[PDB]
Amino acid sequence: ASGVAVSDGVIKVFNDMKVRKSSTPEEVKKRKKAVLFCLSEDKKNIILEEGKEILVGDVGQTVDDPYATFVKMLPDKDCRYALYDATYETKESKKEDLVFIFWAPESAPLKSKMIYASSKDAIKKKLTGIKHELQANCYEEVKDRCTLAEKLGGSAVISLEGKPL
Amino acid sequence: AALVVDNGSGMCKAGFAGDDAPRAVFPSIVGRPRDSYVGDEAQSKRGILTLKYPIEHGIVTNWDDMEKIWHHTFYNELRVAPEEHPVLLTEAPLNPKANREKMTQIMFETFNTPAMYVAIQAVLSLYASGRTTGIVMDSGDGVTHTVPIYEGYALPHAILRLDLAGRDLTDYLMKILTERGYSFTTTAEREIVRDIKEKLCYVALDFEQEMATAASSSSLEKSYELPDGQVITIGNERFRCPEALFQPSFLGMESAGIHETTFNSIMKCDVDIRKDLYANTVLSGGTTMYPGIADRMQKEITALAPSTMKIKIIAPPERKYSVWIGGSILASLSTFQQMWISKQEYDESGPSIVHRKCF
Amino acid sequence: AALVVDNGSGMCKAGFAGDDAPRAVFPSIVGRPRDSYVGDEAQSKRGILTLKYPIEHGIVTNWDDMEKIWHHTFYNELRVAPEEHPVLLTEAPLNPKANREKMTQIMFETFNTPAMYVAIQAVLSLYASGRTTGIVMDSGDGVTHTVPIYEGYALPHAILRLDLAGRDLTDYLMKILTERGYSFTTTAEREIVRDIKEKLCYVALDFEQEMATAASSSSLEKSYELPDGQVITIGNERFRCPEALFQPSFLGMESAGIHETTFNSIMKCDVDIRKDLYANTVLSGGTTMYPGIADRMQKEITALAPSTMKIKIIAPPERKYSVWIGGSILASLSTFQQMWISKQEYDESGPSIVHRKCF
Amino acid sequence: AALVVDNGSGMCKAGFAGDDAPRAVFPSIVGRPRHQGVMVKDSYVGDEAQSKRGILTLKYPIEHGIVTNWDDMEKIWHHTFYNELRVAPEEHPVLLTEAPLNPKANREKMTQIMFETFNTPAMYVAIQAVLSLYASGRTTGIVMDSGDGVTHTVPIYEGYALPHAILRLDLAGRDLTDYLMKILTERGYSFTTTAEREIVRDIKEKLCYVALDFEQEMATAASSSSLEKSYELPDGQVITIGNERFRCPEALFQPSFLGMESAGIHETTFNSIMKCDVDIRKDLYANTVLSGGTTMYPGIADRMQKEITALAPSTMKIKIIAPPERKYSVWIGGSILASLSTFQQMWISKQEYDESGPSIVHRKCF
Amino acid sequence: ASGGGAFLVLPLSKTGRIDKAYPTVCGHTGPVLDIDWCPHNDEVIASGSEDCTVMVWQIPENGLTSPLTEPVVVLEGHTKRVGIIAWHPTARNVLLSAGCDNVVLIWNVGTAEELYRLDSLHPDLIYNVSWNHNGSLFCSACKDKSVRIIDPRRGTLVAEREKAHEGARPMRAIFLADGKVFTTGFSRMSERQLALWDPENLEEPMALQELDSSNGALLPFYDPDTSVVYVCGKGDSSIRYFEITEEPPYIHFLNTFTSKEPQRGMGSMPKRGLEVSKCEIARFYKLHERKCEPIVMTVPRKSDLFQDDLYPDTAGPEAALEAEEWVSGRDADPILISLREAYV
Amino acid sequence: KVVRQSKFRHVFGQPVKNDQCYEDIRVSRVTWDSTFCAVNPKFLAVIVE
Ligand SMILES: Nc1ncnc2c1ncn2[C@@H]1O[C@H](COP(=O)(O)OP(=O)(O)O)[C@@H](O)[C@H]1O
Ligand SMILES: Nc1ncnc2c1ncn2[C@@H]1O[C@H](COP(=O)(O)OP(=O)(O)O)[C@@H](O)[C@H]1O
Ligand SMILES: Nc1ncnc2c1ncn2[C@@H]1O[C@H](COP(=O)(O)OP(=O)(O)O)[C@@H](O)[C@H]1O
Ligand SMILES: [Mg+2]
Ligand SMILES: [Mg+2]
Ligand SMILES: [Mg+2]
């Protein structure tokens, strides 16, 4: 426990991303498909990484595969916290669930890996309702679609983001 | 955009009206330390807490825990605000009238739902099969109900309840798996045993003949892979576990099997409708998804019913979620919007309005 | 400026928070005549004294000698007054609750530290690697620990302890170095053998093939220069000394190797998390610093784990002092200030405060 | 003269029917040398392996009531008949005991070994819990048999067993022995080898007891030295243990000390009774019988009485029956049963088994 | 197997962990007791089971892809379980089967015929049967403590020795290349013993050496080329090998391989499969309860060249006679091959 | 010697399946203590009310 707090901006974004309110399709296009969390400059609060996010409206027009693009914004030599809204279909239901992703590559500096790992259990407790966790320590554990599909429902998942595995 | 919630005995089915399958299917349990975890969250922590079933046998017993499950369904599973969508609830047969009003009070005062409708699970299964008269053998998680229905109205005096369902079969599967040297005891290994039951178990047409075949060859053996990579093999346990449905003495229970419960409930009805109920026996619930269960039920009931009666067991391929699918289509109809219990109608009549609007 | 003290079984690592490497690394020994000498001074006098390890196996057994080590650490090694800096202490896994309070009382009453904190050595190593779940194979000087950790909490029931580490390998290297005609028996010659072990020894991927290679040619022979100028040559002893880690039978020990200890501790965890532990095996400690040990551990565990299991051994290049570096970065955080146990808090709750602030 | 053989996970009790105590009680271990002989027997069984354990690797053929090595199991039987009892197994009928809910495959191997390897003229397999109630002279009661491998709670009412209400707990004397080793290292004593496991087991059998109130007992030991006892190691050193005396047996009531998700023996016994019919729970509450060596801790009956009455309704009379000879209750009950004139109709002859197979053994048994 | 009986057949290259769902030869309705490969066909194996039937199987070249349930032949001539099966060393498609009904049957695998029936020669349970060098006679160890030498073609008892071993524990009896019989058994004190017998004079054994006082029958593995017999006891963790020579005491103890794990079974690869280039004279597949661990027996030699003395000519995979010719009474030695081409 | 020599000490009874029985037979209610049934390898005779 490093004592790093979660900023009010992160809580509001997760609260909006968790529950869906009845809204016009223009506002539905503004829903966040993925978003990245990073440490502040003073390393005191967990804040939103500006510009590194995917909107629901962006999917299908500019972004072909939301997961393929989501992996790309992950830095190669830095640790990040990710919130990916996964849309997958198993053998008997179509599911839409939140996935909290801990990106800690081996190439990341030692100080970054230590703080992110030590404060992960503190931020995860503030983001109540998340039933899915993905801890990736290298690019090969996060780029493959079957890796998320294996975590979400194991072999029961037959489709991910509208595309068969 | 309506919500359909099927409060099952052990599994809660939830989704949106107009969808083919429920969006969220999670266990209906509340966990407290041996501070409150509901659904899969209470299962991920495993054995540190103790688990309680508020609707253990179709009838809600702990209303405070039931509100937590409903709170978990709307906000965490369906990810919607209940005050913006009408919610269609389902209830077990022989549900006391006090429970119907309590559900009415909870929906409008705790969740402030704009509208609500309450339907009987057994009737919805029969409608989804295109029938108005028949007997629905609903075998769920914690309770098995045989509900004879005539012209869309269940006969309460002929409804029989059996406390023998998938939950008891899952526990029986551990007790027989330990005979092969495996050891499944913790709640974590309960879901592995449940997954084995749902994938490799089947109902044998002739149990005694199937036992001889399994003891003379290995053609019935199947292999299953544990999460940690270990592979286990099960043989005659494939058809011994679901055999407890037809022979409850395997679990030490005195009650009769599902075939005799179906026949006994039919004999409690009027003589002039018994012929119709014999040919319109509809299966429902998760516990009726074992391959070969429709053939076994046909063979068993025929041996009980008169030889001049024509027996047809109806097992639709989607009978696992027929209650929810039947409720989802009904809630999505434009003509059904006049059948809701509006909040304005709730303030004038109180919780008692559910008796005259949903029967 | 906070202090980070890593009281290891055979080496004491001390320094200031925010630094990349510990300032002082000295043996944790106290010497008495066959009047009290601590640290490298106790080794400078060589054989006149008798040496004792108060923390011989990760757990403090002589608190009087432990205070001498800490007093020597602050005043002679760190060269600061302990009453002006907060001190972060580290403890071995399965450390008894009585030892945590004894450490708290000593640090606040004998040294009058303004603040104090206790952290688990295994958890800091896992955090330094950027992980919260996994198994840490901490092999130090006098003890080797396999600590499976889930969500930042070590599982006490699944921790396995092996009394086989660099101290035993150093003694083993002496015994096999006498087979070449060399003689290392004195305490002064012990540090030479330890130096030889750290610079020339490596783990062979296949021991039998490597033994045949060294017996047919001279490509594996290395030369080492003694402090007095004599040059010695070691051949197959380079990979025979660290081989005792995977074959404790070389030392006459009945216990299993570090590869089997790692596998056994994983098998003592829940079946659900065994998949995560296999792919998150983290190495730590000075004994692990042999080249080629990660590849040998990967091969040995794979032959034990199921073929469908995906095995990775994590060997960070700075795993020798990952416990200290993980503690130094954590203690230097401005958001870690509120986590310290202040002297005002100690005066109210007594030594028992450490259980609720440091878990 | 019939033989009564009670194979446990830790100890093997053997004797003759009609006697009051087992004639031969030896550990069920097989030891093999782990060094190289330099001066001009590849395995040792029983007490012989216990006296040479300094250079042997001790292994238990049974772990958690499961035979992990049937080749070593035959050594235990061979040592029992020829070295301890010093009798010919082909001249005396053998009455064996089996754990409750024993797999049929395990029972099939036992009868096949006795009839084909040892050539016993007759044989019978009885439930250990049923025999434990014979020794106490009862036909009704719930037996809480806790030994070395596993703990069982078998409710019996008027001679009728309820298999659906039988509960198993994977926690026994061996788990406590391993737990005692783990907590002994906190005091500075290290016991790692299999030979040192027996030393720690002897410590547990002599200085461990069950505290009536665990939290109060912890406070007493943390402020006084009256609870500290001394034990002499085989080679001469003396060790002193404080709170470890009652912390080791306490894992029986709080298995969370071992990282186990199951409930204690007090709750397992209560849960087994609640699985029975309502009308018979009254007789089981007043006839709770303790069996096995794991129930020989001082004060365990008082703690078991105190814990159950907190679970049972206030109007119920909880009576824990703990006979002073409950370590051999299974054997003593077997000796009584084997001496009955009306038991002679239950013997399974060797000739009958050769023509009918193991089907006749699954019948005539429970 | 959960039901019936089966035996796992896998190629030697398929090492490592074996899938629990790997196809097996599951055709018997009872547990399988004995298996034996065809010496003249590396793809034909005969199995005996509790169901009183002997089944001959054909193994595909690449192994099993699906479970094999249909055998080539089903030999049904026994009233009780068949636990003994011994192929003829020279005659093609001639098989011996001995069951618990104390009857010995000579089969013709090619035509599924019962060549001979020997039923009134063993008054008790038969322990093992071994052919002689040329396949004309076979020795058998019986439960009545008697060792018998029987000619199957004439149905006569060539030689017989009562009370070969005084113990009541099971004993074995195999034929040697020079015409002697090697027996392992128990004494009255129940001490495991080894004995050498000359059929021409069975009054007293040539040798009688005691090994230990442990349980479990001793299974001997004879190597005709090296005249070395390996004594492998069921339940023992050690392998003892002895050399049989014409010098007294005719049984010379060589050494003992010691391990820490008891064995459940053992099989020995024939000479044609040994790595000759590594001075390999025997390879034993020791069976644990859940693992098959090969054991390599090597002669320590400095030279890396071919050792002519260590590898004489051995019996080849080519049948000497045919099934029909052997009934007439023809006797011929096994066709010998060389081991030199297999040197690498 | 231990066990009395016999062949039928392990004979067990097993009723046939429900499809092999004879249902809907109004068996006689006479208090007379007879077998009420006579069967040969061909027919089955039952006294009825
Ligand atoms: N394919 C299947 N085969 C057999 N049993 C199943 C299958 N799928 C689900 N089940 C069983 O159905 C039970 C509950 O299903 P459900 O009918 O939804 O119960 P409820 O109506 O009480 O929620 C579960 O305990 C599960 O074991
Ligand atoms: N480069 C190296 N290679 C092999 N062993 C090493 C190396 N560096 C240190 N060691 C060994 O590590 C041991 C102690 O390291 P450390 O992890 O600090 O122990 P502890 O954690 O018990 O203080 C020493 O005995 C030394 O022999
Ligand atoms: N006086 C005692 N106090 C505490 N434990 C005991 C005592 N006597 C025996 N035990 C324990 O009981 C365990 C098993 O005894 P037993 O009932 O013979 O087991 P089993 O039924 O497997 O033979 C032993 O491991 C031993 O540690
Ligand atoms: Mg339902
Ligand atoms: Mg350390
Ligand atoms: Mg016992």
mmCIF file of C-alpha atoms in Angstrom, chain E residues 73-212:
data_model
loop_
_atom_site.group_PDB
_atom_site.id
_atom_site.type_symbol
_atom_site.label_atom_id
_atom_site.label_comp_id
_atom_site.label_asym_id
_atom_site.label_seq_id
_atom_site.Cartn_x
_atom_site.Cartn_y
_atom_site.Cartn_z
ATOM 1 C CA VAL E 73 -8.410 -63.099 -33.751
ATOM 2 C CA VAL E 74 -10.343 -64.140 -30.646
ATOM 3 C CA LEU E 75 -9.067 -67.398 -29.135
ATOM 4 C CA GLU E 76 -11.682 -68.976 -26.849
ATOM 5 C CA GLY E 77 -10.600 -72.291 -25.365
ATOM 6 C CA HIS E 78 -10.264 -71.516 -21.666
ATOM 7 C CA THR E 79 -12.923 -71.787 -18.973
ATOM 8 C CA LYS E 80 -11.120 -69.451 -16.535
ATOM 9 C CA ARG E 81 -8.935 -66.362 -16.799
ATOM 10 C CA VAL E 82 -5.814 -66.503 -18.976
ATOM 11 C CA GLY E 83 -2.748 -64.972 -17.350
ATOM 12 C CA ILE E 84 0.054 -66.702 -19.268
ATOM 13 C CA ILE E 85 0.925 -66.102 -22.932
ATOM 14 C CA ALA E 86 4.151 -67.148 -24.665
ATOM 15 C CA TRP E 87 4.789 -66.878 -28.396
ATOM 16 C CA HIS E 88 6.753 -69.631 -30.094
ATOM 17 C CA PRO E 89 10.396 -68.571 -30.590
ATOM 18 C CA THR E 90 10.669 -70.147 -34.065
ATOM 19 C CA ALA E 91 7.327 -71.413 -35.392
ATOM 20 C CA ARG E 92 5.282 -68.695 -37.075
ATOM 21 C CA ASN E 93 1.820 -67.925 -35.669
ATOM 22 C CA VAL E 94 2.084 -70.579 -32.927
ATOM 23 C CA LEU E 95 0.946 -69.306 -29.527
ATOM 24 C CA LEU E 96 0.765 -70.886 -26.077
ATOM 25 C CA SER E 97 -1.883 -69.939 -23.526
ATOM 26 C CA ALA E 98 -2.227 -71.254 -19.972
ATOM 27 C CA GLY E 99 -5.247 -70.388 -17.843
ATOM 28 C CA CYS E 100 -6.441 -70.849 -14.287
ATOM 29 C CA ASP E 101 -8.269 -74.035 -15.358
ATOM 30 C CA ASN E 102 -4.867 -75.808 -15.410
ATOM 31 C CA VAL E 103 -4.991 -76.368 -19.186
ATOM 32 C CA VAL E 104 -2.348 -75.439 -21.769
ATOM 33 C CA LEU E 105 -3.465 -74.625 -25.317
ATOM 34 C CA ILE E 106 -1.307 -74.351 -28.437
ATOM 35 C CA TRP E 107 -2.916 -71.980 -30.932
ATOM 36 C CA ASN E 108 -2.466 -71.269 -34.629
ATOM 37 C CA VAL E 109 -2.961 -67.503 -34.833
ATOM 38 C CA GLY E 110 -3.104 -67.554 -38.631
ATOM 39 C CA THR E 111 -6.042 -69.975 -38.753
ATOM 40 C CA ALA E 112 -7.474 -69.534 -35.210
ATOM 41 C CA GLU E 113 -6.953 -73.264 -34.651
ATOM 42 C CA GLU E 114 -6.222 -75.121 -31.408
ATOM 43 C CA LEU E 115 -3.198 -77.226 -32.345
ATOM 44 C CA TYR E 116 -2.823 -79.076 -29.035
ATOM 45 C CA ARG E 117 -4.663 -79.422 -25.729
ATOM 46 C CA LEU E 118 -2.748 -80.346 -22.562
ATOM 47 C CA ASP E 119 -5.205 -80.493 -19.656
ATOM 48 C CA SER E 120 -4.160 -83.451 -17.462
ATOM 49 C CA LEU E 121 -0.590 -82.364 -16.678
ATOM 50 C CA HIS E 122 -0.943 -79.563 -14.086
ATOM 51 C CA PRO E 123 -2.907 -80.458 -10.922
ATOM 52 C CA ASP E 124 -2.767 -76.907 -9.505
ATOM 53 C CA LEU E 125 -2.357 -73.282 -10.566
ATOM 54 C CA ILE E 126 0.257 -72.583 -13.242
ATOM 55 C CA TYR E 127 2.671 -69.759 -12.439
ATOM 56 C CA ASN E 128 4.561 -69.280 -15.716
ATOM 57 C CA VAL E 129 5.475 -71.057 -18.950
ATOM 58 C CA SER E 130 8.676 -70.566 -20.954
ATOM 59 C CA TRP E 131 9.716 -72.148 -24.245
ATOM 60 C CA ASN E 132 13.136 -73.739 -24.658
ATOM 61 C CA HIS E 133 15.742 -72.569 -27.176
ATOM 62 C CA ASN E 134 14.324 -74.306 -30.257
ATOM 63 C CA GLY E 135 10.682 -74.112 -29.154
ATOM 64 C CA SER E 136 10.288 -77.889 -28.851
ATOM 65 C CA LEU E 137 9.803 -78.085 -25.064
ATOM 66 C CA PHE E 138 8.461 -75.741 -22.404
ATOM 67 C CA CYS E 139 8.939 -75.608 -18.635
ATOM 68 C CA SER E 140 6.207 -74.646 -16.192
ATOM 69 C CA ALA E 141 6.107 -73.762 -12.499
ATOM 70 C CA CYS E 142 2.977 -74.950 -10.703
ATOM 71 C CA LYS E 143 1.375 -74.185 -7.352
ATOM 72 C CA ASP E 144 2.081 -77.720 -6.072
ATOM 73 C CA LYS E 145 5.799 -76.814 -5.757
ATOM 74 C CA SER E 146 6.580 -78.920 -8.848
ATOM 75 C CA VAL E 147 8.563 -77.918 -11.939
ATOM 76 C CA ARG E 148 7.618 -79.809 -15.099
ATOM 77 C CA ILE E 149 9.177 -80.094 -18.557
ATOM 78 C CA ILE E 150 6.540 -80.946 -21.158
ATOM 79 C CA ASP E 151 6.714 -81.669 -24.881
ATOM 80 C CA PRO E 152 3.557 -80.102 -26.373
ATOM 81 C CA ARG E 153 3.654 -82.030 -29.657
ATOM 82 C CA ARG E 154 3.588 -85.462 -27.980
ATOM 83 C CA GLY E 155 1.681 -84.475 -24.827
ATOM 84 C CA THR E 156 4.207 -86.244 -22.595
ATOM 85 C CA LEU E 157 6.002 -85.202 -19.407
ATOM 86 C CA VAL E 158 9.698 -85.178 -20.303
ATOM 87 C CA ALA E 159 10.941 -84.348 -16.801
ATOM 88 C CA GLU E 160 9.502 -83.317 -13.454
ATOM 89 C CA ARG E 161 10.945 -82.292 -10.080
ATOM 90 C CA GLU E 162 8.716 -82.280 -7.001
ATOM 91 C CA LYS E 163 9.264 -79.769 -4.182
ATOM 92 C CA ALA E 164 11.698 -77.605 -6.133
ATOM 93 C CA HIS E 165 11.211 -74.839 -3.554
ATOM 94 C CA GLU E 166 9.815 -75.673 -0.126
ATOM 95 C CA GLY E 167 8.095 -72.317 0.349
ATOM 96 C CA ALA E 168 4.400 -71.733 -0.236
ATOM 97 C CA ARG E 169 5.019 -68.450 -2.087
ATOM 98 C CA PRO E 170 4.900 -68.315 -5.905
ATOM 99 C CA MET E 171 7.917 -69.398 -7.933
ATOM 100 C CA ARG E 172 9.112 -69.028 -11.526
ATOM 101 C CA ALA E 173 10.832 -71.324 -14.019
ATOM 102 C CA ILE E 174 12.470 -70.382 -17.326
ATOM 103 C CA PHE E 175 14.508 -72.284 -19.908
ATOM 104 C CA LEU E 176 18.128 -71.395 -20.640
ATOM 105 C CA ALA E 177 19.893 -71.453 -23.994
ATOM 106 C CA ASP E 178 22.069 -74.449 -23.079
ATOM 107 C CA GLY E 179 19.110 -76.580 -21.963
ATOM 108 C CA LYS E 180 18.990 -75.899 -18.219
ATOM 109 C CA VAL E 181 16.100 -74.523 -16.155
ATOM 110 C CA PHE E 182 16.529 -71.470 -13.921
ATOM 111 C CA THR E 183 14.102 -71.268 -10.994
ATOM 112 C CA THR E 184 13.412 -68.586 -8.398
ATOM 113 C CA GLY E 185 11.424 -69.530 -5.327
ATOM 114 C CA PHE E 186 11.018 -69.485 -1.564
ATOM 115 C CA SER E 187 12.370 -71.751 1.164
ATOM 116 C CA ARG E 188 10.584 -73.149 4.218
ATOM 117 C CA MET E 189 11.766 -70.151 6.271
ATOM 118 C CA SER E 190 10.417 -68.006 3.373
ATOM 119 C CA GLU E 191 13.834 -66.944 2.087
ATOM 120 C CA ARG E 192 13.998 -66.067 -1.604
ATOM 121 C CA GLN E 193 16.206 -68.510 -3.507
ATOM 122 C CA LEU E 194 17.599 -69.147 -6.981
ATOM 123 C CA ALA E 195 18.134 -72.630 -8.384
ATOM 124 C CA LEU E 196 19.710 -74.160 -11.492
ATOM 125 C CA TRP E 197 18.528 -77.546 -12.766
ATOM 126 C CA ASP E 198 19.764 -80.074 -15.308
ATOM 127 C CA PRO E 199 16.827 -81.964 -16.889
ATOM 128 C CA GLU E 200 18.936 -85.124 -17.298
ATOM 129 C CA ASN E 201 19.475 -85.295 -13.506
ATOM 130 C CA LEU E 202 16.874 -83.558 -11.327
ATOM 131 C CA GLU E 203 17.851 -85.298 -8.075
ATOM 132 C CA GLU E 204 19.552 -82.168 -6.714
ATOM 133 C CA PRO E 205 20.016 -78.652 -8.113
ATOM 134 C CA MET E 206 23.384 -77.581 -9.455
ATOM 135 C CA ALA E 207 23.104 -74.337 -7.474
ATOM 136 C CA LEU E 208 20.936 -72.979 -4.668
ATOM 137 C CA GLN E 209 21.640 -69.426 -3.478
ATOM 138 C CA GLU E 210 19.568 -67.375 -1.044
ATOM 139 C CA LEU E 211 19.022 -63.661 -1.653
ATOM 140 C CA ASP E 212 16.882 -62.225 1.170
#
